[PDB]
Amino acid sequence: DPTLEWFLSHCHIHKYPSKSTLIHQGEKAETLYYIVKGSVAVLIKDEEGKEMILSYLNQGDFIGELGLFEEGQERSAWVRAKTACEVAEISYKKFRQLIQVNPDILMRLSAQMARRLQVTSEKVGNLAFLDVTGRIAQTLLNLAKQPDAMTHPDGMQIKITRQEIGQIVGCSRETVGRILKMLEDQNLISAHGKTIVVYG
Amino acid sequence: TDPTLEWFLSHCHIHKYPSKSTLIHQGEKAETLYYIVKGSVAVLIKDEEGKEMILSYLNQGDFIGELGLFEEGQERSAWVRAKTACEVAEISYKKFRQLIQVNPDILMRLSAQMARRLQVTSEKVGNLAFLDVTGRIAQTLLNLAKQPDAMTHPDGMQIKITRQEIGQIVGCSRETVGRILKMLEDQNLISAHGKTIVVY
Numbered sequence: 001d002p003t004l005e006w007f008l009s010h011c012h013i014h015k016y017p018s019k020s021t022l023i024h025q026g027e028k029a030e031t032l033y034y035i036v037k038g039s040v041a042v043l044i045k046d047e048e049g050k051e052m053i054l055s056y057l058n059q060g061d062f063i064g065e066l067g068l069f070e071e072g073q074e075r076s077a078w079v080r081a082k083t084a085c086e087v088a089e090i091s092y093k094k095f096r097q098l099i100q101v102n103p104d105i106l107m108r109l110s111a112q113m114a115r116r117l118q119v120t121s122e123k124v125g126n127l128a129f130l131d132v133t134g135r136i137a138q139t140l141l142n143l144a145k146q147p148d149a150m151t152h153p154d155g156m157q158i159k160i161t162r163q164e165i166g167q168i169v170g171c172s173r174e175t176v177g178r179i180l181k182m183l184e185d186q187n188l189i190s191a192h193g194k195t196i197v198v199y200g
Numbered sequence: 201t202d203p204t205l206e207w208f209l210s211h212c213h214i215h216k217y218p219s220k221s222t223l224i225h226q227g228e229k230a231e232t233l234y235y236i237v238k239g240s241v242a243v244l245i246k247d248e249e250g251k252e253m254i255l256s257y258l259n260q261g262d263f264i265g266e267l268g269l270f271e272e273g274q275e276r277s278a279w280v281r282a283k284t285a286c287e288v289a290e291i292s293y294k295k296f297r298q299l300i301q302v303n304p305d306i307l308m309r310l311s312a313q314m315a316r317r318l319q320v321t322s323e324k325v326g327n328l329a330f331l332d333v334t335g336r337i338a339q340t341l342l343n344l345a346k347q348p349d350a351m352t353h354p355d356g357m358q359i360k361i362t363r364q365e366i367g368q369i370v371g372c373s374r375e376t377v378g379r380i381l382k383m384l385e386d387q388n389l390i391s392a393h394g395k396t397i398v399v400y
């Protein structure tokens with residue numbers, strides 16, 4: 001679509017190696033990103049320093065949008081490259097100009113914000129309403145739908161550490177280990193360390 | 201005076217909702233957007249058995265029902281309940297989308313609110329994670345003792361909050377809250393005197 005191409009023509013490209021940080025929580029926010037390639041993790045850290053993965057974002061996702069709409073905003077979270085990342089970046093000042101030229105670019109941005117509120121709202125509810133077995137089950141399904149998932153003779157294969165899962169659902173690495181074992185025993189997955197096949 | 205808002209409002213029609221009435225039911229097909237002209241509401245989600253978690257309080261000046269705007273056929277993501285007598289302006293998504301094309305500033309106003317809500321709800325995820333209901337209640341009382349209208353007290357800091365309110369913050373039953381406060385008291389973390397609590 002030409003709207004996106006137009007948008008990108010006003011951006012400039014940065015490349016981020018896997019594990020590098022694109023955005024630090026608390027920074028003054030002045031620029032918008034769009035993921036051209038790769039994936040990032042959005043992270044926050046509780047009052048006792050435990051890291052918490054709010055979301056993964058992928059090709060086609062905007063980042064750094066939350067600071068755009070009122071003056072003097074700080075970045076609300078850390079964003080770290082999960083894989084080699086290529087991102088287009090544009091100043092808020094410039095983006096505001098584009099918005100006036102073609103409102104559709106704001107529509108696409110706002111649509112992702114709405115989706116994120118829906119998703120994050122469900123996540124907070126599940127923290128109270130779902131047990132860790134349930135949260136991990138859902139997470140495994142979600143990861144199987146991610147661009148880095150691999151089709152498998154037996155289903156969809158994912159690569160992920162117990163630590164990462166713990167940071168997603170809010171539990172210890174050991175808890176994850178035990179629950180992965182249960183889900184296996186329940187014939188929902190087949191574990192292989194940092195390699196898991198999800199059935200469906 | 202906000203010319204942009206008044207223009208938008210001229211395309212709306214007004215509804216009056218009595219205190220405790222439900223403006224929006226989770227699951228209903230979303231086709232309209234609201235703007236609160238007067239009053240306050242609570243946004244809540246519920247587990248299969250109907251236990252409530254409050255996500256936000258919204259009041260005069262806030263949009264509600266915005267999350268289904270960017271793609272037809274979505275369901276309301278939460279319940280919205282009137283806390284006081286409420287007057288809301290309502291408009292179809294179809295009409296609102298036309299306004300956006302005429303003047304994208306109306307979408308900017310909306311998006312500013314979506315962005316604040318995502319930050320707030322993300323913070324709630326970080327707050328509730330890695331804790332069970334007891335830990336969540338302990339944390340909740342500790343945060344309230346740092347809020348504006350939290351009066352000083354010889355033993356610590358005195359706050360006023362009901363069991364139902366606490367339960368809605370952490371997503372548990374008031375029965376559960378009651379049990380937990382008694383223990384917290386026993387463990388010399390707090391002193392509970394009805395709707396009044398002193399946090400040490």
Ligand SMILES: Nc1ncnc2c1ncn2[C@@H]1O[C@@H]2COP(=O)(O)O[C@H]2[C@H]1O
Binds near residue numbers: 062063065322
């Ligand atoms: N709950 C969330 N879901 C998805 N993305 C988020 C969430 N919270 C923060 N972000 C992203 O992380 C970014 C951190 O910088 P910004 O606040 O400017 O913009 C933020 C969003 O792009």
Ligand SMILES: Nc1ncnc2c1ncn2[C@@H]1O[C@@H]2COP(=O)(O)O[C@H]2[C@H]1O
Binds near residue numbers: 230277279
């Ligand atoms: N996390 C949240 N914070 C603030 N408001 C919310 C949140 N989740 C849902 N809402 C509001 O509740 C509404 C329910 O209907 P909609 O999904 O159409 O639009 C939603 C928002 O207006």
Ligand SMILES: [Co+2]
Binds near residue numbers: 012014089
């Ligand atoms: Co740059």
Ligand SMILES: [Co+2]
Binds near residue numbers: 213215290
């Ligand atoms: Co109506």
